PDB file of C-alpha atoms and ligand atoms in Angstrom:
ATOM      1  CA  UNK N   2      -1.735  25.260  14.373  1.00 15.53           C
ATOM      2  CA  UNK N   3      -2.755  21.739  12.463  1.00 14.16           C
ATOM      3  CA  UNK N   4      -6.824  21.785  12.897  1.00 17.13           C
ATOM      4  CA  UNK N   5      -9.030  18.900  11.237  1.00 15.40           C
ATOM      5  CA  UNK N   6     -13.346  19.522  10.760  1.00 14.67           C
ATOM      6  CA  UNK N   7     -14.389  17.074  13.048  1.00 14.64           C
ATOM      7  CA  UNK N   8     -14.164  17.401  17.090  1.00 13.72           C
ATOM      8  CA  UNK N   9     -16.045  15.180  19.831  1.00 16.00           C
ATOM      9  CA  UNK N  10     -20.082  16.610  19.591  1.00 18.06           C
ATOM     10  CA  UNK N  11     -20.925  17.506  23.178  1.00 16.12           C
ATOM     11  CA  UNK N  12     -23.282  16.075  25.025  1.00 14.63           C
ATOM     12  CA  UNK N  13     -22.391  12.992  23.115  1.00 12.87           C
ATOM     13  CA  UNK N  14     -24.558  10.852  24.531  1.00 11.36           C
ATOM     14  CA  UNK N  15     -23.105   6.418  22.936  1.00  8.75           C
ATOM     15  CA  UNK N  16     -26.532   4.517  23.909  1.00  8.11           C
ATOM     16  CA  UNK N  17     -29.183   6.870  22.502  1.00  9.17           C
ATOM     17  CA  UNK N  18     -26.825   7.573  19.904  1.00  8.90           C
ATOM     18  CA  UNK N  19     -27.505   2.919  19.642  1.00 10.28           C
ATOM     19  CA  UNK N  20     -31.080   3.186  19.268  1.00 10.23           C
ATOM     20  CA  UNK N  21     -31.739   6.332  16.520  1.00 15.21           C
ATOM     21  CA  UNK N  22     -28.971   4.030  14.589  1.00 17.43           C
ATOM     22  CA  UNK N  23     -30.770   0.940  15.596  1.00 17.44           C
ATOM     23  CA  UNK N  24     -34.044   2.529  14.450  1.00 17.83           C
ATOM     24  CA  UNK N  25     -33.012   3.157  11.415  1.00 18.20           C
ATOM     25  CA  UNK N  26     -32.117   0.113  10.358  1.00 16.98           C
ATOM     26  CA  UNK N  27     -34.475  -2.517  11.938  1.00 18.45           C
ATOM     27  CA  UNK N  28     -37.275  -3.367   9.422  1.00 21.09           C
ATOM     28  CA  UNK N  29     -37.774  -2.759   5.818  1.00 22.93           C
ATOM     29  CA  UNK N  30     -35.584   0.071   4.661  1.00 28.01           C
ATOM     30  CA  UNK N  31     -33.372   2.612   5.262  1.00 26.50           C
ATOM     31  CA  UNK N  32     -32.788   5.536   7.005  1.00 26.20           C
ATOM     32  CA  UNK N  33     -30.107   6.818   4.899  1.00 25.38           C
ATOM     33  CA  UNK N  34     -29.983  10.673   5.897  1.00 26.35           C
ATOM     34  CA  UNK N  35     -30.554   9.631   9.709  1.00 27.31           C
ATOM     35  CA  UNK N  36     -27.062   8.102   9.642  1.00 25.59           C
ATOM     36  CA  UNK N  37     -24.836   9.894   8.226  1.00 24.26           C
ATOM     37  CA  UNK N  38     -26.180  13.386  10.163  1.00 23.07           C
ATOM     38  CA  UNK N  39     -25.050  11.285  13.097  1.00 22.99           C
ATOM     39  CA  UNK N  40     -22.288   9.558  12.469  1.00 29.18           C
ATOM     40  CA  UNK N  41     -20.375  12.331  10.462  1.00 28.24           C
ATOM     41  CA  UNK N  42     -21.302  14.831  13.792  1.00 26.12           C
ATOM     42  CA  UNK N  43     -19.439  12.227  15.910  1.00 27.38           C
ATOM     43  CA  UNK N  44     -16.051  11.932  16.661  1.00 25.25           C
ATOM     44  CA  UNK N  45     -14.045   8.755  15.683  1.00 26.79           C
ATOM     45  CA  UNK N  46     -13.704   7.905  19.262  1.00 26.54           C
ATOM     46  CA  UNK N  47     -17.299   8.508  19.869  1.00 26.78           C
ATOM     47  CA  UNK N  48     -17.793   6.139  17.005  1.00 29.16           C
ATOM     48  CA  UNK N  49     -15.844   3.466  18.926  1.00 28.81           C
ATOM     49  CA  UNK N  50     -18.366   4.155  22.171  1.00 28.81           C
ATOM     50  CA  UNK N  51     -21.244   3.453  20.456  1.00 29.35           C
ATOM     51  CA  UNK N  52     -20.721   0.597  17.928  1.00 28.52           C
ATOM     52  CA  UNK N  53     -19.404  -0.923  21.491  1.00 27.70           C
ATOM     53  CA  UNK N  54     -23.098   0.097  23.157  1.00 30.68           C
ATOM     54  CA  UNK N  55     -25.076  -1.084  20.142  1.00 32.95           C
ATOM     55  CA  UNK N  56     -23.952  -3.674  20.905  1.00 32.79           C
ATOM     56  CA  UNK N  57     -24.150  -3.952  23.966  1.00 34.62           C
ATOM     57  CA  UNK N  58     -28.036  -2.981  23.697  1.00 35.27           C
ATOM     58  CA  UNK N  59     -28.607  -5.274  20.789  1.00 36.15           C
ATOM     59  CA  UNK N  60     -26.429  -8.008  20.315  1.00 38.34           C
ATOM     60  CA  UNK N  61     -25.393  -7.271  17.131  1.00 36.29           C
ATOM     61  CA  UNK N  62     -22.174  -5.348  15.614  1.00 37.20           C
ATOM     62  CA  UNK N  63     -22.946  -1.938  13.612  1.00 39.46           C
ATOM     63  CA  UNK N  64     -20.379  -2.474  11.176  1.00 39.00           C
ATOM     64  CA  UNK N  65     -21.980  -6.001   9.303  1.00 38.89           C
ATOM     65  CA  UNK N  66     -25.421  -4.426   9.648  1.00 41.65           C
ATOM     66  CA  UNK N  67     -24.280  -1.071   8.393  1.00 42.43           C
ATOM     67  CA  UNK N  68     -22.314  -3.275   5.888  1.00 42.39           C
ATOM     68  CA  UNK N  69     -26.043  -4.701   4.971  1.00 39.92           C
ATOM     69  CA  UNK N  70     -28.216  -2.278   5.033  1.00 37.95           C
ATOM     70  CA  UNK N  71     -25.728   0.535   2.684  1.00 36.45           C
ATOM     71  CA  UNK N  72     -24.126  -0.067  -0.579  1.00 37.45           C
ATOM     72  CA  UNK N  73     -22.050   1.335  -2.519  1.00 37.46           C
ATOM     73  CA  UNK N  74     -20.089   3.881  -2.508  1.00 38.76           C
ATOM     74  CA  UNK N  75     -21.536   5.881   0.252  1.00 41.18           C
ATOM     75  CA  UNK N  76     -20.947   2.278   1.777  1.00 42.35           C
ATOM     76  CA  UNK N  77     -17.433   2.597   1.491  1.00 45.88           C
ATOM     77  CA  UNK N  78     -17.234   6.213   2.779  1.00 45.59           C
ATOM     78  CA  UNK N  79     -19.113   4.632   6.798  1.00 41.89           C
ATOM     79  CA  UNK N  80     -17.339   1.915   7.249  1.00 41.44           C
ATOM     80  CA  UNK N  81     -14.286   3.991   6.655  1.00 43.27           C
ATOM     81  CA  UNK N  82     -15.648   6.268   9.299  1.00 42.22           C
ATOM     82  CA  UNK N  83     -15.950   3.611  11.617  1.00 43.07           C
ATOM     83  CA  UNK N  84     -12.579   2.465  11.470  1.00 41.92           C
ATOM     84  CA  UNK N  85     -10.056   2.865  14.800  1.00 40.27           C
ATOM     85  CA  UNK N  86      -8.267   5.656  14.366  1.00 37.79           C
ATOM     86  CA  UNK N  87      -5.499   4.086  14.843  1.00 35.52           C
ATOM     87  CA  UNK N  88      -6.195   1.511  12.321  1.00 38.47           C
ATOM     88  CA  UNK N  89      -6.913   3.151   8.957  1.00 38.32           C
ATOM     89  CA  UNK N  90      -3.377   3.331   7.826  1.00 42.73           C
ATOM     90  CA  UNK N  91      -3.037   0.180   8.182  1.00 41.64           C
ATOM     91  CA  UNK N  92      -5.532  -0.908   6.811  1.00 41.36           C
ATOM     92  CA  UNK N  93      -5.015   0.998   3.760  1.00 41.59           C
ATOM     93  CA  UNK N  94      -1.271  -0.084   3.376  1.00 40.37           C
ATOM     94  CA  UNK N  95      -2.777  -3.598   4.067  1.00 37.74           C
ATOM     95  CA  UNK N  96      -5.001  -2.857   1.536  1.00 38.70           C
ATOM     96  CA  UNK N  97      -2.593  -2.221  -0.814  1.00 37.29           C
ATOM     97  CA  UNK N  98      -0.949  -4.966  -0.071  1.00 35.26           C
ATOM     98  CA  UNK N  99      -3.003  -7.902  -0.317  1.00 37.06           C
ATOM     99  CA  UNK N 100      -3.721  -9.905  -3.207  1.00 37.57           C
ATOM    100  CA  UNK N 101      -2.207 -10.404  -6.716  1.00 37.90           C
ATOM    101  CA  UNK N 102      -1.339  -6.256  -7.869  1.00 37.82           C
ATOM    102  CA  UNK N 103       0.191  -3.427  -5.429  1.00 40.11           C
ATOM    103  CA  UNK N 104      -1.438   0.052  -5.361  1.00 39.65           C
ATOM    104  CA  UNK N 105       1.442   2.121  -4.918  1.00 37.93           C
ATOM    105  CA  UNK N 106      -0.395   5.094  -5.126  1.00 35.77           C
ATOM    106  CA  UNK N 107      -0.899   4.455  -2.379  1.00 34.86           C
ATOM    107  CA  UNK N 108       1.746   3.300  -0.210  1.00 39.41           C
ATOM    108  CA  UNK N 109       3.328   6.685  -2.312  1.00 37.31           C
ATOM    109  CA  UNK N 110       1.048   8.702  -0.601  1.00 39.13           C
ATOM    110  CA  UNK N 111       0.572   7.695   3.230  1.00 38.37           C
ATOM    111  CA  UNK N 112       4.063   6.991   4.390  1.00 38.07           C
ATOM    112  CA  UNK N 113       5.782   9.843   2.489  1.00 37.27           C
ATOM    113  CA  UNK N 114       2.758  12.397   4.122  1.00 36.55           C
ATOM    114  CA  UNK N 115       3.037  10.115   7.035  1.00 38.15           C
ATOM    115  CA  UNK N 116       5.246  11.568  10.135  1.00 37.59           C
ATOM    116  CA  UNK N 117       8.168   9.568  11.607  1.00 32.96           C
ATOM    117  CA  UNK N 118       5.689   9.714  14.836  1.00 31.14           C
ATOM    118  CA  UNK N 119       3.187   8.222  12.642  1.00 32.99           C
ATOM    119  CA  UNK N 120       4.929   5.874  11.211  1.00 29.34           C
ATOM    120  CA  UNK N 121       6.170   4.048  13.732  1.00 29.93           C
ATOM    121  CA  UNK N 122       1.529   4.267  15.667  1.00 30.65           C
ATOM    122  CA  UNK N 123       0.602   3.083  11.730  1.00 29.24           C
ATOM    123  CA  UNK N 124       3.705  -0.225  12.348  1.00 32.27           C
ATOM    124  CA  UNK N 125       3.039  -1.191  16.092  1.00 31.06           C
ATOM    125  CA  UNK N 126      -0.868  -1.231  14.560  1.00 30.88           C
ATOM    126  CA  UNK N 127      -0.525  -3.467  11.527  1.00 33.69           C
ATOM    127  CA  UNK N 128       1.943  -5.648  13.028  1.00 31.75           C
ATOM    128  CA  UNK N 129      -0.911  -6.313  16.118  1.00 33.73           C
ATOM    129  CA  UNK N 130      -3.914  -6.895  13.608  1.00 34.24           C
ATOM    130  CA  UNK N 131      -2.438  -8.639  10.508  1.00 35.28           C
ATOM    131  CA  UNK N 132       0.800 -10.383  12.708  1.00 36.19           C
ATOM    132  CA  UNK N 133       2.916  -9.335  10.367  1.00 39.29           C
ATOM    133  CA  UNK N 134       5.984  -7.422   9.368  1.00 39.04           C
ATOM    134  CA  UNK N 135       4.536  -3.821   7.663  1.00 40.83           C
ATOM    135  CA  UNK N 136       8.270  -3.187   6.565  1.00 37.58           C
ATOM    136  CA  UNK N 137       8.678  -7.184   4.974  1.00 35.69           C
ATOM    137  CA  UNK N 138       5.636  -6.855   3.144  1.00 36.57           C
ATOM    138  CA  UNK N 139       6.449  -4.035   1.243  1.00 35.79           C
ATOM    139  CA  UNK N 140       9.502  -5.517   0.472  1.00 33.75           C
ATOM    140  CA  UNK N 141       8.240  -8.124  -0.619  1.00 30.82           C
ATOM    141  CA  UNK N 142       5.596  -6.632  -3.016  1.00 32.13           C
ATOM    142  CA  UNK N 143       8.339  -4.059  -4.487  1.00 28.75           C
ATOM    143  CA  UNK N 144      11.451  -3.029  -6.080  1.00 26.79           C
ATOM    144  CA  UNK N 145      14.237  -1.063  -7.172  1.00 24.80           C
ATOM    145  CA  UNK N 146      14.978   2.727  -5.689  1.00 24.53           C
ATOM    146  CA  UNK N 147      11.467   2.598  -4.998  1.00 26.53           C
ATOM    147  CA  UNK N 148      11.153  -0.234  -2.525  1.00 24.60           C
ATOM    148  CA  UNK N 149      14.935   1.255  -1.071  1.00 25.85           C
ATOM    149  CA  UNK N 150      13.512   4.625  -0.205  1.00 25.64           C
ATOM    150  CA  UNK N 151      10.324   3.400   0.902  1.00 28.18           C
ATOM    151  CA  UNK N 152      12.436   1.746   3.385  1.00 28.46           C
ATOM    152  CA  UNK N 153      14.038   3.934   4.302  1.00 27.93           C
ATOM    153  CA  UNK N 154      11.348   6.522   5.442  1.00 27.10           C
ATOM    154  CA  UNK N 155       9.521   3.314   7.501  1.00 24.40           C
ATOM    155  CA  UNK N 156      12.623   3.022   9.329  1.00 22.42           C
ATOM    156  CA  UNK N 157      11.406   7.023  10.804  1.00 22.50           C
ATOM    157  CA  UNK N 158      14.618   7.932  11.610  1.00 22.76           C
ATOM    158  CA  UNK N 159      14.391  11.637   9.820  1.00 22.39           C
ATOM    159  CA  UNK N 160      16.702  14.211  11.847  1.00 23.77           C
ATOM    160  CA  UNK N 161      15.114  16.320  14.405  1.00 21.84           C
ATOM    161  CA  UNK N 162      14.424  19.313  14.176  1.00 24.21           C
ATOM    162  CA  UNK N 163      17.837  21.608  15.728  1.00 25.10           C
ATOM    163  CA  UNK N 164      19.635  24.930  14.664  1.00 26.17           C
ATOM    164  CA  UNK N 165      20.414  24.961  10.946  1.00 28.10           C
ATOM    165  CA  UNK N 166      24.031  24.758   9.898  1.00 31.22           C
ATOM    166  CA  UNK N 167      24.259  26.413   7.297  1.00 32.05           C
ATOM    167  CA  UNK N 168      27.874  24.788   5.336  1.00 33.98           C
ATOM    168  CA  UNK N 169      25.855  21.334   5.925  1.00 37.49           C
ATOM    169  CA  UNK N 170      23.553  23.427   3.548  1.00 33.14           C
ATOM    170  CA  UNK N 171      24.992  24.295   1.081  1.00 33.01           C
ATOM    171  CA  UNK N 172      27.290  20.437   0.891  1.00 31.86           C
ATOM    172  CA  UNK N 173      23.939  18.749   0.594  1.00 29.74           C
ATOM    173  CA  UNK N 174      22.969  20.687  -2.335  1.00 25.31           C
ATOM    174  CA  UNK N 175      25.707  20.848  -3.985  1.00 28.42           C
ATOM    175  CA  UNK N 176      25.703  16.783  -4.023  1.00 30.11           C
ATOM    176  CA  UNK N 177      22.107  16.723  -5.078  1.00 31.11           C
ATOM    177  CA  UNK N 178      23.090  18.701  -8.102  1.00 32.09           C
ATOM    178  CA  UNK N 179      26.673  16.368  -8.293  1.00 33.20           C
ATOM    179  CA  UNK N 180      24.237  13.222  -8.282  1.00 36.07           C
ATOM    180  CA  UNK N 181      21.438  14.561 -10.901  1.00 36.84           C
ATOM    181  CA  UNK N 182      22.118  17.661 -13.308  1.00 34.86           C
ATOM    182  CA  UNK N 183      26.256  17.040 -13.117  1.00 34.03           C
ATOM    183  CA  UNK N 184      25.890  13.782 -13.635  1.00 38.09           C
ATOM    184  CA  UNK N 185      25.562  11.268 -16.333  1.00 36.03           C
ATOM    185  CA  UNK N 186      23.149   9.414 -15.238  1.00 37.06           C
ATOM    186  CA  UNK N 187      21.787   9.076 -11.542  1.00 37.05           C
ATOM    187  CA  UNK N 188      23.273   8.592  -8.135  1.00 35.37           C
ATOM    188  CA  UNK N 189      19.689   7.100  -6.591  1.00 34.51           C
ATOM    189  CA  UNK N 190      21.536   6.191  -3.209  1.00 29.77           C
ATOM    190  CA  UNK N 191      22.404   9.908  -2.657  1.00 24.27           C
ATOM    191  CA  UNK N 192      18.868  11.779  -3.496  1.00 20.72           C
ATOM    192  CA  UNK N 193      17.819   8.737  -1.045  1.00 23.37           C
ATOM    193  CA  UNK N 194      19.957   9.052   1.844  1.00 22.67           C
ATOM    194  CA  UNK N 195      19.425  12.801   1.856  1.00 22.26           C
ATOM    195  CA  UNK N 196      15.668  13.908   1.198  1.00 19.90           C
ATOM    196  CA  UNK N 197      14.911  10.152   3.184  1.00 18.23           C
ATOM    197  CA  UNK N 198      16.935  11.502   6.426  1.00 16.66           C
ATOM    198  CA  UNK N 199      17.605  15.212   6.990  1.00 17.64           C
ATOM    199  CA  UNK N 200      15.624  17.254   9.116  1.00 20.86           C
ATOM    200  CA  UNK N 201      12.445  18.498   7.663  1.00 22.78           C
ATOM    201  CA  UNK N 202      14.065  22.258   8.222  1.00 22.44           C
ATOM    202  CA  UNK N 203      17.357  21.432   7.495  1.00 25.59           C
ATOM    203  CA  UNK N 204      15.755  20.317   3.950  1.00 23.81           C
ATOM    204  CA  UNK N 205      13.189  23.533   3.578  1.00 26.89           C
ATOM    205  CA  UNK N 206      16.766  25.289   3.412  1.00 23.79           C
ATOM    206  CA  UNK N 207      18.494  22.762   1.114  1.00 26.01           C
ATOM    207  CA  UNK N 208      15.823  22.835  -1.546  1.00 27.34           C
ATOM    208  CA  UNK N 209      15.814  27.003  -1.625  1.00 25.63           C
ATOM    209  CA  UNK N 210      19.866  26.379  -1.642  1.00 23.91           C
ATOM    210  CA  UNK N 211      19.466  23.736  -4.190  1.00 22.81           C
ATOM    211  CA  UNK N 212      17.286  26.369  -5.841  1.00 19.91           C
ATOM    212  CA  UNK N 213      19.990  28.666  -6.069  1.00 19.15           C
ATOM    213  CA  UNK N 214      23.089  27.267  -7.638  1.00 17.24           C
ATOM    214  CA  UNK N 215      21.229  24.752 -10.202  1.00 16.17           C
ATOM    215  CA  UNK N 216      18.280  27.153 -11.631  1.00 17.80           C
ATOM    216  CA  UNK N 217      16.426  24.451 -10.932  1.00 23.46           C
ATOM    217  CA  UNK N 218      13.560  23.594  -8.277  1.00 22.31           C
ATOM    218  CA  UNK N 219      14.313  20.034  -7.038  1.00 19.77           C
ATOM    219  CA  UNK N 220      11.182  19.283  -7.662  1.00 17.04           C
ATOM    220  CA  UNK N 221      11.984  20.051 -11.540  1.00 19.24           C
ATOM    221  CA  UNK N 222      15.408  18.105 -11.646  1.00 17.77           C
ATOM    222  CA  UNK N 223      13.736  15.117 -10.210  1.00 15.68           C
ATOM    223  CA  UNK N 224      11.662  15.155 -13.436  1.00 16.28           C
ATOM    224  CA  UNK N 225      14.135  15.078 -15.302  1.00 12.62           C
ATOM    225  CA  UNK N 226      16.342  12.441 -13.963  1.00 14.53           C
ATOM    226  CA  UNK N 227      14.050  10.332 -12.479  1.00 16.55           C
ATOM    227  CA  UNK N 228      10.953   7.806 -13.604  1.00 17.98           C
ATOM    228  CA  UNK N 229       8.244   4.912 -12.845  1.00 14.81           C
ATOM    229  CA  UNK N 230       7.907   4.475  -8.599  1.00 12.80           C
ATOM    230  CA  UNK N 231      10.542   6.270  -7.469  1.00 10.90           C
ATOM    231  CA  UNK N 232       9.739   9.553  -9.341  1.00  9.06           C
ATOM    232  CA  UNK N 233       6.523   9.477  -8.394  1.00  8.27           C
ATOM    233  CA  UNK N 234       7.917   8.951  -4.207  1.00  5.93           C
ATOM    234  CA  UNK N 235      10.539  11.585  -4.012  1.00  5.88           C
ATOM    235  CA  UNK N 236       7.843  13.940  -5.469  1.00  8.27           C
ATOM    236  CA  UNK N 237       6.000  12.591  -2.791  1.00  7.83           C
ATOM    237  CA  UNK N 238       8.408  13.183  -0.744  1.00  9.04           C
ATOM    238  CA  UNK N 239       9.371  16.988  -1.939  1.00  7.07           C
ATOM    239  CA  UNK N 240       5.879  17.913  -1.333  1.00  8.59           C
ATOM    240  CA  UNK N 241       5.541  16.380   2.019  1.00 10.00           C
ATOM    241  CA  UNK N 242       8.831  18.119   3.553  1.00 12.34           C
ATOM    242  CA  UNK N 243       7.351  21.766   2.259  1.00 14.17           C
ATOM    243  CA  UNK N 244       3.435  21.111   2.996  1.00 14.30           C
ATOM    244  CA  UNK N 245       1.600  18.264   3.874  1.00 15.92           C
ATOM    245  CA  UNK N 246      -1.409  20.345   3.370  1.00 15.74           C
ATOM    246  CA  UNK N 247      -0.662  20.915  -0.047  1.00 16.00           C
ATOM    247  CA  UNK N 248       0.338  17.823  -1.016  1.00 18.54           C
ATOM    248  CA  UNK N 249      -2.489  16.198   0.077  1.00 15.41           C
ATOM    249  CA  UNK N 250      -4.767  18.813  -1.108  1.00 17.53           C
ATOM    250  CA  UNK N 251      -3.452  18.811  -4.173  1.00 16.88           C
ATOM    251  CA  UNK N 252      -3.239  14.604  -4.197  1.00 17.87           C
ATOM    252  CA  UNK N 253      -7.284  15.171  -3.762  1.00 17.68           C
ATOM    253  CA  UNK N 254      -7.457  17.265  -6.552  1.00 17.39           C
ATOM    254  CA  UNK N 255      -6.013  14.851  -9.076  1.00 17.34           C
ATOM    255  CA  UNK N 256      -8.269  12.536  -7.674  1.00 13.34           C
ATOM    256  CA  UNK N 257     -11.608  14.666  -9.001  1.00 13.78           C
ATOM    257  CA  UNK N 258      -9.775  15.886 -11.833  1.00 13.48           C
ATOM    258  CA  UNK N 259     -11.062  15.516 -15.437  1.00 12.15           C
ATOM    259  CA  UNK N 260     -13.306  12.299 -16.320  1.00 13.43           C
ATOM    260  CA  UNK N 261     -14.446  10.475 -13.444  1.00 15.40           C
ATOM    261  CA  UNK N 262     -13.638  10.139  -9.340  1.00 14.47           C
ATOM    262  CA  UNK N 263     -10.588   8.606  -7.810  1.00 12.66           C
ATOM    263  CA  UNK N 264     -13.042   7.666  -5.090  1.00 11.48           C
ATOM    264  CA  UNK N 265     -10.963   5.463  -2.798  1.00 10.56           C
ATOM    265  CA  UNK N 266      -8.813   8.239  -2.177  1.00 10.05           C
ATOM    266  CA  UNK N 267     -11.254  10.575  -2.208  1.00 11.76           C
ATOM    267  CA  UNK N 268     -12.240   8.600   0.968  1.00  7.61           C
ATOM    268  CA  UNK N 269      -9.004   8.278   1.930  1.00  9.39           C
ATOM    269  CA  UNK N 270      -7.754  11.074   2.969  1.00  9.08           C
ATOM    270  CA  UNK N 271     -11.017  13.140   3.686  1.00  8.89           C
ATOM    271  CA  UNK N 272     -11.087  10.735   6.337  1.00 12.05           C
ATOM    272  CA  UNK N 273      -7.794  10.209   7.470  1.00 12.34           C
ATOM    273  CA  UNK N 274      -7.550  13.728   8.022  1.00 10.90           C
ATOM    274  CA  UNK N 275     -10.424  14.516   9.266  1.00 11.68           C
ATOM    275  CA  UNK N 276      -9.298  15.246  13.040  1.00 13.04           C
ATOM    276  CA  UNK N 277      -6.090  16.181  11.601  1.00 10.16           C
ATOM    277  CA  UNK N 278      -5.391  18.964   9.588  1.00  7.72           C
ATOM    278  CA  UNK N 279      -8.118  18.411   6.964  1.00  7.76           C
ATOM    279  CA  UNK N 280      -9.164  22.552   7.543  1.00  6.43           C
ATOM    280  CA  UNK N 281      -5.746  23.738   6.356  1.00  6.58           C
ATOM    281  CA  UNK N 282      -5.699  21.109   3.562  1.00  7.69           C
ATOM    282  CA  UNK N 283      -9.199  22.918   1.850  1.00  7.31           C
ATOM    283  CA  UNK N 284      -7.336  26.733   2.819  1.00 10.90           C
ATOM    284  CA  UNK N 285      -4.335  24.755   0.645  1.00 14.73           C
ATOM    285  CA  UNK N 286      -6.494  23.377  -1.984  1.00 15.08           C
ATOM    286  CA  UNK N 287      -8.454  27.174  -2.085  1.00 16.43           C
ATOM    287  CA  UNK N 288      -5.097  28.792  -2.746  1.00 14.57           C
ATOM    288  CA  UNK N 289      -3.189  26.503  -5.065  1.00 16.66           C
ATOM    289  CA  UNK N 290      -6.709  25.670  -7.327  1.00 16.24           C
ATOM    290  CA  UNK N 291      -8.702  28.642  -7.127  1.00 18.30           C
ATOM    291  CA  UNK N 292     -11.787  26.224  -6.124  1.00 19.16           C
ATOM    292  CA  UNK N 293     -12.819  25.315  -2.157  1.00 18.96           C
ATOM    293  CA  UNK N 294     -12.749  21.894  -2.582  1.00 16.18           C
ATOM    294  CA  UNK N 295     -16.824  21.674  -0.526  1.00 15.16           C
ATOM    295  CA  UNK N 296     -17.631  22.460  -4.791  1.00 15.65           C
ATOM    296  CA  UNK N 297     -15.001  20.545  -5.949  1.00 17.06           C
ATOM    297  CA  UNK N 298     -16.701  17.285  -4.358  1.00 17.90           C
ATOM    298  CA  UNK N 299     -20.352  18.839  -4.246  1.00 16.94           C
ATOM    299  CA  UNK N 300     -19.588  19.099  -7.951  1.00 16.24           C
ATOM    300  CA  UNK N 301     -18.264  14.968  -8.919  1.00 11.68           C
ATOM    301  CA  UNK N 302     -20.283  13.456  -6.420  1.00 11.53           C
ATOM    302  CA  UNK N 303     -24.143  12.357  -5.980  1.00 13.65           C
ATOM    303  CA  UNK N 304     -26.490  10.909  -3.503  1.00 11.37           C
ATOM    304  CA  UNK N 305     -25.829  10.399   0.079  1.00  9.98           C
ATOM    305  CA  UNK N 306     -22.264   9.771  -0.379  1.00  8.42           C
ATOM    306  CA  UNK N 307     -22.211  13.364  -1.798  1.00  6.78           C
ATOM    307  CA  UNK N 308     -23.989  14.742   1.556  1.00  7.00           C
ATOM    308  CA  UNK N 309     -21.616  11.929   3.940  1.00  9.52           C
ATOM    309  CA  UNK N 310     -18.415  13.904   1.960  1.00  9.47           C
ATOM    310  CA  UNK N 311     -19.977  17.562   2.264  1.00  5.25           C
ATOM    311  CA  UNK N 312     -20.809  17.286   5.730  1.00  6.00           C
ATOM    312  CA  UNK N 313     -17.310  15.624   6.441  1.00  8.81           C
ATOM    313  CA  UNK N 314     -15.480  18.614   4.568  1.00  8.95           C
ATOM    314  CA  UNK N 315     -17.481  21.688   5.478  1.00 10.40           C
ATOM    315  CA  UNK N 316     -15.673  25.589   4.480  1.00 11.98           C
ATOM    316  CA  UNK N 317     -18.805  25.432   1.590  1.00 11.56           C
ATOM    317  CA  UNK N 318     -17.777  29.013   1.065  1.00 14.66           C
ATOM    318  CA  UNK N 319     -14.162  29.192   1.013  1.00 11.86           C
TER     319      UNK N 319
HETATM  320 CA1   CA E 401     -33.721  -2.811   7.494  1.00 12.30          CA
HETATM  321 CA1   CA E 402       0.965  -7.700  -3.689  1.00 11.71          CA
HETATM  322 CA1   CA E 403      22.198  13.193 -14.524  1.00 13.56          CA
HETATM  323 CA1   CA E 404      10.260  11.697 -15.461  1.00 13.74          CA
HETATM  324 CA1   CA E 405     -14.006  14.611 -11.995  1.00 15.74          CA
END
């Protein structure tokens, strides 16, 4: 099943951990090594208890103190690691929508790869934290079919996996064929309804059947029929339906692909999935890119930031 790389540390003592952290920042200097080896070895819920003990003992906010002592990517990784799990995805979405400029790669990445259950959780958290409706904020900063597809997904009303109705699979496959390849132009609405509301098990069957009747994989047709933000979203949805860990592994790969590194994306995926399916993401990363995620990271990052990442990911050998 699904498996992360971070678990609750046994023999957990919040007060003790708070003191270790406190001693690592007191006086001039900062013992980063001590901080990273500790926080990456504690589950997210435990980090929250440490933060609570820290404030109780010293009357200081652990996160703000680290924001003062830490710098750069390492600081960003530590701050994201301290964000409550139930609020992280909402946090990211909020930052991708705030100020002039909307970060579409973020909206697409999260809303496409998160399950209906997760999306429901994210919407509640977002509203309680920012006193604003997530859907309304998305609509306000986006437009066209891209916006429409995101809204469909945000409803979290995807059909439930039940017995497969063969005739419905043929109907849907043929409907997609007719809405794209056999149509002068494209019927985006058809693509949105089907890909956004049908059950996961149903769609996996539709993808195979579509391949059989058209000679094309649904991804190829999408690339041939659509463009812009809509194309990226549709591909994210399809890839997620097939395998969320694969889609995420691919997102990671392209983050460390070529000159430089998309650090924000790199941190987001590793942190948000660390306690869910990061282990699976590794297996999908190896099987599809001839290398282990560990090596990719180990050879694209530097310093403490690099050390923290490797400890969270693990898998040195894969
Ligand atoms: Ca200090
Ligand atoms: Ca904006
Ligand atoms: Ca067409
Ligand atoms: Ca295209
Ligand atoms: Ca790189």
